[PDB]
C-alpha cells in the first residue's frame, strides 16, 4: 500500500500509487491545515512552465543533459495538460517559502520522468529532484517566480478582460440613456437634474481610471526573481541564466515577462502583488459603488425609488411570492467586501517580510488569486445578467424629477440665492410646488418661473 | 529667539530652552522627532502619567524607600499637571520611541524640576528630587506607559463612551416605544416586502446597541489590569515586596476607578491584547452605528423624491448652491467617525500582533488610535442623540401610501392558497399596473371576504391569530 | 440529460438525476463566480438541523402534516449524515441573503422526501418545496441560523478547544521552565533577566485571555434568528414557533441555542458575527506574536539567537542542504494574517445592513467559518509539532545572560542610576566585566557586587 | 460678547470679532465632534486657492465684477499667508460633503472683504457670500477640488522628496558596503553569503519601485472637480469656466492641475484618493520592512546579531542605565501601521458614495493628508537620524558569516545535494566545523575545501 523514498531526515513511507515522495508526504501529514490540497492551481501551473523553463535555461547554458531536460518537459507538459492534478496534495498553510510545494514539483517531476523514460515507481529516479529538477533554483526565486506567472496570467487574461466588457457596457448605457432626464441625488436628498446617461458615464469613467490603475502596476508584476537562488546572489547559477530562463517563461506562457531588476526585492519582500492588489482593490471600491447605486436605483418596485428596470433573473424569496431582488448588485457588493479585506492581508503579510525572504508566499498568491478571480468572474456575470439590460422606468423618472424642489436653483442668477432659498422652504412647509410659491411670495412672475426653470436646459451641453 | 540652559543626560550636554521645566531627554525627543504636529502625545496620556507618578510616590513611601519630604514636592508637581498649568511643559509627539521613554522622562524630568523651583530652587540648578532614582523609583517606561494607557483608555471608556452610548441607545428604545403603532412597509434587500412597525424597526437600533454595551463592559475586566510593577521586563526588578499592589491601590483611590494589578506583568508588558480586545468592541458598536446612522437618512431621503418616511431636525443650510437644501449631516458625521474607528481597529490590530519578547513598542500609535475611537464614539453619540435622534418623527400620509402600495402584502395569503396562487396575483397586478385585491378577485383565487379578512397589514406584524 | 422543473418564473432545464430544481439551477448558472459548491458544507449542515427542527415545531403547532414532517426529517437525516453533499453545487458569491441556497434545501429535501415515498423523481413531489418545507420560514430567518449554528459550534467544539489545548501545553513550558534565567529582550536589545518559564508564562496568559473574550460573545451568538420570518415580525409563525423550534435545535445539535431576543436586530445586522469574529481576531494576534517570538529564540543554528531547541520536522530548503526551519510558526503567523483580512471583511460587511435585512450573510459566514477552522487546525497542527518539543539551548542561554551590561541594573537601588551607568559605560569602553569595573573605580565591593548582581534574584521584587 | 448673522434658517449668535458668519457658527456649535478646528489647515489652503481662481475665471467670463474679485482675491491672500487661521474652527465630522467649510471660507472671504473696503463687521457685506464668493460653484466640486490640491501638493512637494532622500541613501549605503560580505538569513535560518551593500541595495529597490507607484498615480489626482457645481452637470458656470478655473489654479499653485475628464466620477467618488493612498500604503509596507531589518541587524548589543552599527541619538531606558534602542526604526513602523489602517478608512469611504456624491470627503481628506504628512516627516527623521550614519560591525559580521552551516551550499555543483546535506549534518551533529567533517567524512580534501568554500565567491553567479 505504501512505499519507502527518503530524504535528509530520513525514510518516509509514500502512498504506494502517487508520484511525490518523502518530503511532499511529511508536509502533507504535518500541515492538516484547512481543506486538503489548498494550494491554488494557477501555482501550480505556474511551476510547470518555470520548471521547464529553468531546464531549458540549464541544457544551454550546458549544466544538464537534453536527455534529462526532454523528461522534465515531458513531466512539465502533463502538469500543464491537467494530467497530474491528484499528485498535488498540499495546502496553502505550508512553510511560508513554499518549499514544499516546491519539492512537490521536483519529487513529481523526477519520478515521472523516471516512467516516462522506462523505470518503476520505487526505483531510485534516473532524474534526482534536487541536482536534476531543481538545478539552479531555490523555493526562494521559484515560488516568488510562480507567484508573478499566476498573477500576471489572471490579471491580464481573465481581470482586465471582464473589467473592459462591464465598462464598455456601461459605455453603451450612457450613450442610450443620453436624452434620458431625471433627478440628481446628493446626501440622498433630492438635487438638480442629469441625465441617466450621465449618471451611467460616472460609472463608465470609474472603471477606466480603474483599468489604468491595474495597468500601470504591470511594469513591477512582470519582473521574475527566477535566477536570485536562496538569498538573491545567483548562487550556484551559470552566468546568464536569469535572463534566459525569463525568455523561456515568456516564450512557453506568451507574456511578457523580464527577469528581476533587484533579486534582493524579489525575494525579500512581495511589493508588487501589494501594488497590483491595491489597483484590485480601488476597481473593488468602485465596483461597490457602481452596483449599489444600480440596487438603490432599482429599489421598489412601488415603495421605493424605481428610476430602472433591471433583467429579473430568478424568484427573489421563499416567502415574498413574485418578489425579485438585485442579486447581481448583491454578488458584486459582496466579492468587494472580500477584496478589501484581501487587500488587509496582502498588506499586512508584505511588511513582514525577514532579512533574505517574505515568508507569507502562500497566503499572499492565494488571497491575490482569489481577488483576481472573482473581480473577472463578477464583472462577466454582472454584465451578462443585469447591466446589459438596464432601462429605464421613465414615467417614474419624469414624476421624481418634476417633484424635486431643488429645481429652484435654476433661479439663482436672476433672483439670488436667498430669494430662491424663500422659494423652496415655503413650498416645502406648505405642501405646495415651487412656481405656486414663486408666484403667491411675490419673487418671480408666473411668466419668468416658465421660462427660468426648466429640467432638460440644468444638465450642461 | 531662544534662551538656554545646560542640561545633561548619560550621553552628555543638551541645551534646553531656558524657562522650560523640561530636560536633556525631553529635549532630544523634541529635536529627533519632528514627526506630524508638535506635541500630539494625547494629552489623557500626560494626564494618567500625572495619577500614577504620585501613586508610585505614595507607595514607595509607604514601602520604606523614598522620604515623606519627597514623595510632598513629587506630588505637588504631579497636582499640577493634572490640575492643567504645566500643558506647555509636554511637547513630545506620539512617533517617538514605540515605548514612550521619551514621554516617561518628559514627566520624570518636568517633575523633578518643577519640584525644584516649588521647593525654592532655581531652574539650572541639579533638583533635590532625582528623575530616575526618585520620580522614577520602582519604575521603568515598560511599566508606566501602559499603565498610563490603560488609565486613560479606562476612564475614556467608563466615562465618555459607554455614557454617551447608552444616552442614544434610550433614546432609541423611547422611539420604539413612541412608534410602537405606527405600520410601515418593510424593505429587504432594498424592495418592498412585508409591514413592520416603525416602533418594531426602531426597536433593533435600540438593540444593537444594546448588544454592543454588553460587548464592550465585557472587556473591562482586561482592561483595568495595570502593569505598574513589572519594572524592564515583568519581572518586577526594583521593586518593593508588595508594590504593585500597593501603587494599584493608590492609582484607584486618585482616579476613583477600580483598577488592580495585572495578573501577569509579561503579557502586560509584550502586549497590548487588552487595548485590542477594548477596541474591537468599540468597532463592533461603530458598525451598528454606520448601520443605525445609514437607514435613518434613506428614512429621510426627499423630502419628494426619495423614501421620506420620517422627519429628521434641520439645523443648518445642507447647500451652498441649492436654495433650501436640508442634509442629514447628523447621519454623516456617524457614518464617518465609523469609517475611522474600522481604520483605527486595522491599526490597533496589526500594531498588537507586533510584540518582540519582553516588550511591544507600538505603545503610542495604539494608545492614539484607541483614545479617538472612544472620544469620537463618544461625541457623535451624543451630537447624534441631541441634534438628530430626539427629534425623529413619522411623516405619516408618507408611511400609509408606501405601505399600501407594497404588492408583498400578498404574503398573507400564503398559508390560505399557496405560495404559488399568491405570487399569480401579485405578478399579475405587477404586469397590470392594478392592486392585489382587483387581481386577486378578477383571477377568481380569493373571494372578496377572504382577502379582506387574510390580508390586514396591522396583522401582518406578529404572529398568526 | 435534463428533465423540466418550474418555478413561478418559469420552466427550467435541471440535471435529470439531481434532487435540486429550478431554483437551485437558476442560482448554479447565473452565479459562475469562483469554484463550483463554495457555500461552506457546515451552513448546508446547520440547514438539516434548522429545516428538521422546523417541521417538527410546525406539527407539534398543528400546521403541518405528521406524515410530511416525517418525509422532511428523513431528508433532512440524510443531508447530516453527509449522504447528499453533491445536492448542493451553489456558491458562496449568490444573493446576498442566501436564499438560494435555502431554496436549494427546500428542493432537495421535497424531491429526495418524494423518492423516499416511493415516487419518481421528475413527478411534483407529495412535499411542496415553499409551502411545506419552508412553513413558517424565510431565507432571512434561515440562512441567518445556520450561521449561528455553524458558527457557534465550530467555535466551542474545534477553535476553542483547539486554543485550550496549545494553552495548556504553554503553561506547562512555562512551569518545565521555571528555573531557566535568561536574558530579557526589550525593542530588540539586551535587557534584565527573565525566567523562559516567565516568558512562557507570558503566552499562556495571553491564549487565557483570548479565550475568556471569545466564550463572553457566546450568549450573542447563541442567539437565533429563526421565527422572524420576512422581516422580523414572525409574519406566517404559529404562536410559539419561535421558542419552540429553538428548543428543537438546542436538542438536536446539544448546544444552548435560544430564540433572538430582538429579531429586526438578529435580521437587519450580523452583529454578533462582528463580535465573536473580533474575539477570534485577538486571539489571532496573539498568536502571531507567540509564533514569531518562538520562530526568532530558534533562530540559527549558529548565527542567530539559538536560545530554544524546536522539533526539526522536515528539510527546510531545495538548494542549502541540511537547513531546517520553523515552518509551524510561518503556518501560524500566515494564518494569523488570513484572520485580520476577515475581519476587516466582516466588519465592512456587517455595517452595511439596509432596513430590515442585512444582504452580505454568505460572505461573512464564509470568512467566519475560516478563521474559526483555521485558528482551530494550526493551532493544534502548532502544538503537535512544535510547542510540545521547546527546550531551552541551555549553554546557549547562559552565554546570552551572561553578557548583558543590562545586568548593571541590579545596582541602581544601592549606588543609583547616573553611577550604575558609569559601571556600565566603562565596561563597554574597556571590554572589561561590570564586576572588574564596579571594584575598579569602588563603587561596590567585590562581596557585595556578587550578592547584588545575582542574575536568579532579579527575576522578582526585592527580597 | 455676540453679534447676530442670519441665513436662510434664522438668526446666529456669532462671536462678535471673528469673521465667520450664521452657517460656519451653526456647524462649530452642531458637530462637537473631537477637537476644535480639526478640518486640516492644507484644505483650508487649497480653498484660498480656489475661491481665488474662481473669482478670477468668473471675472473673465462677465459674471463677477472685477471690483469684487479684487477684494475675494485680498482676502484670499490673507488665507494663503496665514493670516487668518483663527477663523476656522471646524471639524472633519461635519457634514460629508464639507458644506459647512465651503461656508466657512464664502462668510470669512465676504466679511474680511467688506472690512478691507472700510466697512465695519456686522454690516451687510458688499460681497455675498453665496452669489459672489461661492459664484458658479458647490461645496460639492470645490471641496474635491480642495483635496485633490492639497493631496497634489503634499505628495509632490513633501512626500516624494522625502521618500527620494532616505532611497538616495540606501542607495549610497548599497555602493558603500558593496564588498562587506555577510551571512544571509532565510527564515530567521543561517543562509548563504550576501554582500551588506546587496542587502541595502533590496531596501533601495522598494522605495524606488514605490516611487514609480506613487507618480503613476498623479495623473488622475491632478484632475479636479471644479465646475461640476451640485451634481456634475456646470449648472449655473457660464461657457469655458471648467477650463478656465483650471488654468488659474495651476498658475496660482505652479502645479500641473487640469480640470476633471467626468465630472460625475470626480463628485460620485473619490477614487484617485484610493488610488494615490494604495500607492502610499506600498511605499508604507516597504519602510515598516526596511527598518524592521534596520534594528534586527542593530539588535544587541550581546543578545542579538549585531552586524551593524547604527546611531546612538539619546538614552533608550528611565532604568536599564547606558542601553540605547533603535528608536528612529520604532517611529518609522509605527507610521506604517498607521498608514495601513488609513488606508481601511479611505477605502470603506471610497466605497460608500450615493448617487451622485461621496458624502465621505473629509475623513478620506484627513487619513490621506495624515498618511502623506507622516511618511515624508518620518523618511527624513530616519534618513538624517539613523541610514545616514549606518555602519558595518566588522568582526560580528565575520564570526557570523563563517559560522553558517549552510556555507556547505557553496559544495552542491562539485558534491551534490546529498553528499552536502551530510556534511552540514554531521557538523551540526558533533559540534564541529563544515571543513572538519567534510575531511573527515573523506567527501572533499582540505585543499578542495579551501578553494571552494569562499564566502566572496558565493555573491554571485558561477564562474
Given at each position: 500500500?505504501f512505499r519507502?523514498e527518503?530524504?535528509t531526515m530520513?525514510?518516509?513511507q509514500?502512498?504506494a500509487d502517487?508520484?511525490?515522495?518523502?518530503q511532499?508526504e511529511?508536509?502533507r501529514n504535518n500541515?492538516?491545515?484547512?481543506?486538503?490540497?489548498?494550494?491554488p492551481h494557477?501555482?501550480?501551473?505556474?511551476?510547470?512552465?518555470?520548471?521547464?523553463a529553468?531546464?531549458?535555461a540549464?541544457?544551454?547554458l550546458?549544466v544538464?543533459?537534453?536527455?534529462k531536460?526532454?523528461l522534465?518537459?515531458?513531466?512539465?507538459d502533463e502538469?500543464?495538460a491537467?494530467?497530474?492534478?491528484?499528485?498535488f496534495?498540499?495546502?496553502?498553510?505550508?512553510?511560508?517559502?513554499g518549499t514544499?510545494?516546491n519539492?512537490?514539483?521536483?519529487?513529481?517531476?523526477?519520478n515521472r520522468?523516471?516512467?516516462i523514460?522506462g523505470?518503476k515507481?520505487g526505483?531510485?529516479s534516473?532524474?534526482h529532484p534536487?541536482?536534476?529538477?531543481?538545478?539552479?533554483?531555490?523555493?526562494?526565486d521559484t515560488?516568488?517566480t510562480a507567484?508573478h506567472?499566476?498573477?500576471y496570467?489572471?490579471?491580464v487574461?481573465?481581470?482586465?478582460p471582464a473589467?473592459e466588457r462591464?465598462?464598455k457596457?456601461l459605455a453603451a448605457?450612457?450613450?442610450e440613456?443620453?436624452?434620458?432626464?431625471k433627478?440628481g441625488?446628493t446626501?440622498?436628498m433630492?438635487?438638480?437634474?442629469l441625465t441617466?446617461?450621465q449618471e451611467?458615464?460616472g460609472?463608465?469613467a470609474?472603471?477606466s481610471?480603474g483599468?489604468?490603475?491595474?495597468?500601470?502596476?504591470?511594469?513591477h508584476?512582470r519582473?521574475l526573481?527566477?535566477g536570485?537562488?536562496?538569498?538573491?546572489?545567483?548562487?550556484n547559477?551559470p552566468?546568464?541564466?536569469?535572463?534566459k530562463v525569463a525568455?523561456?517563461i515568456?516564450?512557453?506562457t506568451g507574456?511578457?515577462?523580464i527577469?528581476?531588476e533587484?533579486?534582493?526585492?524579489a525575494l525579500?519582500?512581495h511589493?508588487?502583488?501589494?501594488?497590483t492588489?491595491?489597483?484590485?482593490?480601488?476597481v473593488a471600491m468602485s465596483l461597490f459603488?457602481?452596483?449599489?447605486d444600480i440596487?438603490?436605483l432599482?429599489?421598489?418596485?412601488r415603495?421605493?425609488?424605481?428610476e430602472?428596470?433591471?433583467?429579473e433573473?430568478?424568484?427573489?424569496?421563499?416567502i415574498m411570492?413574485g418578489?425579485?431582488?438585485?442579486?447581481?448588485?448583491?454578488?458584486?457588493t459582496m466579492?468587494?467586501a472580500?477584496v478589501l479585506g484581501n487587500?488587509?492581508?496582502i498588506?499586512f503579510?508584505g511588511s513582514?517580510?525577514?532579512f533574505?525572504?517574505?515568508?507569507?508566499?502562500?497566503?499572499?498568491?492565494?488571497?491575490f488569486l482569489?481577488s483576481?478571480?472573482l473581480?473577472?468572474?463578477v464583472?462577466?456575470?454582472?454584465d451578462e445578467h443585469?447591466?446589459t439590460g438596464?432601462?429605464?422606468?421613465?414615467?417614474?423618472?419624469?414624476?421624481?424629477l418634476?417633484?424635486?424642489?431643488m429645481?429652484?436653483?435654476?433661479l439663482?442668477?436672476h433672483?439670488?440665492?436667498?430669494?430662491?432659498?424663500?422659494?423652496a422652504?415655503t413650498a416645502?412647509?406648505?405642501?405646495?410646488?415651487l412656481?405656486?410659491?414663486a408666484?403667491?411670495?411675490?419673487?418671480?412672475?408666473?411668466?419668468?418661473?416658465?421660462?427660468?426653470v426648466v429640467?432638460?436646459?440644468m444638465v450642461?451641453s
Amino acid at each position: 500500500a505504501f512505499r519507502i523514498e527518503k530524504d535528509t531526515m530520513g525514510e518516509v513511507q509514500v502512498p504506494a500509487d502517487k508520484y511525490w515522495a518523502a518530503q511532499t508526504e511529511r508536509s502533507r501529514n504535518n500541515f492538516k491545515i484547512g481543506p486538503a490540497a489548498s494550494m491554488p492551481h494557477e501555482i501550480i501551473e505556474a511551476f510547470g512552465y518555470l520548471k521547464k523553463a529553468a531546464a531549458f535555461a540549464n541544457t544551454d547554458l550546458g549544466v544538464l543533459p537534453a536527455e534529462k531536460r526532454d523528461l522534465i518537459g515531458q513531466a512539465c507538459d502533463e502538469i500543464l495538460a491537467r494530467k497530474l492534478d491528484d499528485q498535488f496534495p498540499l495546502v496553502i498553510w505550508q512553510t511560508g517559502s513554499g518549499t514544499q510545494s516546491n519539492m512537490n514539483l521536483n519529487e513529481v517531476i523526477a519520478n515521472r520522468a523516471h516512467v516516462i523514460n522506462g523505470g518503476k515507481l520505487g526505483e531510485k529516479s534516473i532524474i534526482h529532484p534536487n541536482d536534476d529538477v531543481n538545478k539552479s533554483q531555490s523555493s526562494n526565486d521559484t515560488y516568488p517566480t510562480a507567484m508573478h506567472i499566476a498573477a500576471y496570467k489572471k490579471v491580464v487574461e481573465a481581470t482586465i478582460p471582464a473589467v473592459e466588457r462591464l465598462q464598455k457596457t456601461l459605455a453603451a448605457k450612457a450613450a442610450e440613456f443620453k436624452d434620458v432626464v431625471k433627478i440628481g441625488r446628493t446626501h440622498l436628498m433630492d438635487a438638480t437634474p442629469l441625465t441617466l446617461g450621465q449618471e451611467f458615464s460616472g460609472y463608465a469613467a470609474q472603471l477606466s481610471f480603474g483599468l489604468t490603475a491595474i495597468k500601470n502596476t504591470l511594469p513591477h508584476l512582470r519582473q521574475l526573481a527566477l535566477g536570485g537562488t536562496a538569498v538573491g546572489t545567483g548562487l550556484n547559477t551559470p552566468k546568464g541564466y536569469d535572463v534566459k530562463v525569463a525568455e523561456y517563461i515568456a516564450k512557453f506562457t506568451g507574456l511578457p515577462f523580464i527577469t528581476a531588476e533587484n533579486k534582493f526585492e524579489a525575494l525579500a519582500t512581495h511589493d508588487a502583488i501589494v501594488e497590483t492588489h491595491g489597483a484590485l482593490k480601488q476597481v473593488a471600491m468602485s465596483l461597490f459603488k457602481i452596483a449599489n447605486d444600480i440596487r438603490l436605483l432599482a429599489s421598489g418596485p412601488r415603495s421605493g425609488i424605481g428610476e430602472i428596470l433591471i433583467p429579473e433573473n430568478e424568484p427573489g424569496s421563499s416567502i415574498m411570492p413574485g418578489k425579485v431582488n438585485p442579486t447581481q448588485c448583491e454578488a458584486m457588493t459582496m466579492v468587494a467586501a472580500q477584496v478589501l479585506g484581501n487587500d488587509t492581508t496582502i498588506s499586512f503579510a508584505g511588511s513582514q517580510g525577514h532579512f533574505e525572504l517574505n515568508v507569507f508566499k502562500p497566503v499572499m498568491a492565494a488571497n491575490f488569486l482569489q481577488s483576481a478571480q472573482l473581480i473577472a468572474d463578477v464583472c462577466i456575470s454582472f454584465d451578462e445578467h443585469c447591466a446589459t439590460g438596464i432601462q429605464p422606468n421613465t414615467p417614474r423618472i419624469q414624476h421624481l424629477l418634476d417633484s424635486s424642489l431643488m429645481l429652484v436653483t435654476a433661479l439663482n442668477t436672476h433672483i439670488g440665492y436667498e430669494n430662491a432659498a424663500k422659494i423652496a422652504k415655503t413650498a416645502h412647509k406648505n405642501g405646495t410646488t415651487l412656481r405656486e410659491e414663486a408666484i403667491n411670495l411675490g419673487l418671480v412672475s408666473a411668466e419668468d418661473f416658465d421660462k427660468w426653470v426648466v429640467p432638460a436646459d440644468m444638465v450642461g451641453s
